[PDB]
Amino acid sequence: KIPGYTYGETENRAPFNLEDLKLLKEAVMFTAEDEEYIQKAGEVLEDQVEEILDTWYGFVGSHPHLLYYFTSPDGTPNEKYLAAVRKRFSRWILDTSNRSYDQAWLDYQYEIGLRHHRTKKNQTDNVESVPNIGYRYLVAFIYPFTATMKPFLARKGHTPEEVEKMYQAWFKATTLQVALWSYPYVKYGDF
Amino acid sequence: KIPGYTYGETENRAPFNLEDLKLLKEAVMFTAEDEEYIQKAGEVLEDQVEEILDTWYGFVGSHPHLLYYFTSPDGTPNEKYLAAVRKRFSRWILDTSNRSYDQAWLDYQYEIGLRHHRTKKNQTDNVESVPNIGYRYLVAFIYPFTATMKPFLARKGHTPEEVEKMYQAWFKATTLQVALWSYPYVKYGDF
Ligand code: HEM
Ligand code: HEM
Ligand SMILES: [C-]#N
Ligand SMILES: [C-]#N
Numbered sequence A, B: 001k002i003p004g005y006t007y008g009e010t011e012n013r014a015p016f017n018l019e020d021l022k023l024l025k026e027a028v029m030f031t032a033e034d035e036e037y038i039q040k041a042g043e044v045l046e047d048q049v050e051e052i053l054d055t056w057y058g059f060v061g062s063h064p065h066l067l068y069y070f071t072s073p074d075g076t077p078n079e080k081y082l083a084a085v086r087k088r089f090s091r092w093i094l095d096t097s098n099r100s101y102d103q104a105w106l107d108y109q110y111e112i113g114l115r116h117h118r119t120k121k122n123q124t125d126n127v128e129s130v131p132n133i134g135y136r137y138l139v140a141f142i143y144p145f146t147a148t149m150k151p152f153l154a155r156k157g158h159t160p161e162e163v164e165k166m167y168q169a170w171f172k173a174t175t176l177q178v179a180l181w182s183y184p185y186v187k188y189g190d191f
Helices: A018-027 A032-061 A064-070 A079-098 A103-116 A135-140 A142-154 A160-181 B018-027 B032-061 B064-070 B079-098 B103-116 B135-140 B142-154 B160-181
Strands: none
Touching (some): A018 A160, A018 B064, A018 B135, A032 A064, A032 A079, A032 A160, A064 A079, A079 A103, A079 A160, A135 A160, A135 B018, A135 B160, A160 B135, B018 B103, B018 B160, B032 B064, B032 B142, B032 B160, B079 B103, B079 B160, B103 B160, B142 B160
């Protein structure tokens, strides 16, 4: 039903496993408290996803060198591409909140990294676009993504601590995932 | 006077320039407001740097797979290595606050990336240690670094907005720099 969304039906096993994930979670100070707070945040954000997506792609569309990654060769945004990616991003927000971070989760994170990278970019949607998303922007996007998310987390009326715990859990989870997605970009053996 | 600190005397021009930097600053939503707030934060943090360093290396030392990157071949921390890096980290905190982010700043960021990477790791201090810091941990460290910094920013008694503006400026600046440092790790042409 969501075109191109292949969580749990990926073709490849990730080159990282649950032991790697344990060690990476430690590097981002993610614990069981964060698991609980990310799940709570899912409940807060669930009815807000359309507006989150409009704000997020508003930012991407606000800078030509960012919108660039969704463009057709003629430099104009590929509207099919954008709309199809948007649907999978909506799922990713929910998955971050509700999935057990197990090997199927890791296999999908590897797949998402491959889809930003030249390895698989443009294949899922069968579009003609830019071959690769420069890595420098994947890392950079940790910031604006967390900044876009923060105001939404307030709105179900929660204590300041709860809201900071949810935002911080999202900052950890975002950093964790972007780190995983780096794999196909990194010189073999340097990751 | 600070061994190995070669800001402004680097051997190589960075493969990125001030136009790249403009585009990356936009990707992390860094503006002139952030320049002002990062400078303000420098004034707040200046007398606190020793304690920041003790807290930061407390975290690194708290996980064997992280402390690993400062170890001698026998698996024990190289104390010379740690102490020498600590001095340059102290400078980096101040430089983030006070340097114009120009080509000399970029050339040093390239150098810092090279020093985490196998390209130059262990050369500055002439130590025998792990050849490479896996990239996955450079990205991950954005989180704990910002989390370690946050409580220090409170303590000169500033408004909540001011403190959040300073923390957010530091989160942007950290993300920006780690993105730059990724260069030698990334497959040529994918950055
Ligand atoms: C914090 C960083 C980022 C997050 C959280 C994120 C999130 C996502 C998600 C969830 C998807 C869909 C994955 C799937 O197919 O199921 C996706 C795809 C995509 N993203 Fe990102 N992304 C990030 C960085 C970037 C950057 C820097 C760009 C550059 C504008 C970008 C542009 C795209 C594009 C063009 C696709 C489609 C890739 C393809 O052809 O399959 N993303 N992103
Ligand atoms: C947010 C991420 C990070 C920040 C802000 C940071 C900061 C720094 C700074 C400022 C230096 C000294 C640069 C110079 O020589 O002037 C340095 C060196 C070093 N860092 Fe990091 N670092 C980060 C990620 C990491 C990670 C993930 C590790 C793994 C423990 C690590 C371990 C080291 C080591 C071993 C050196 C010495 C490298 C060499 O041999 O020259 N750093 N770091
Ligand atoms: C990516 N959105
Ligand atoms: C790196 N400390």
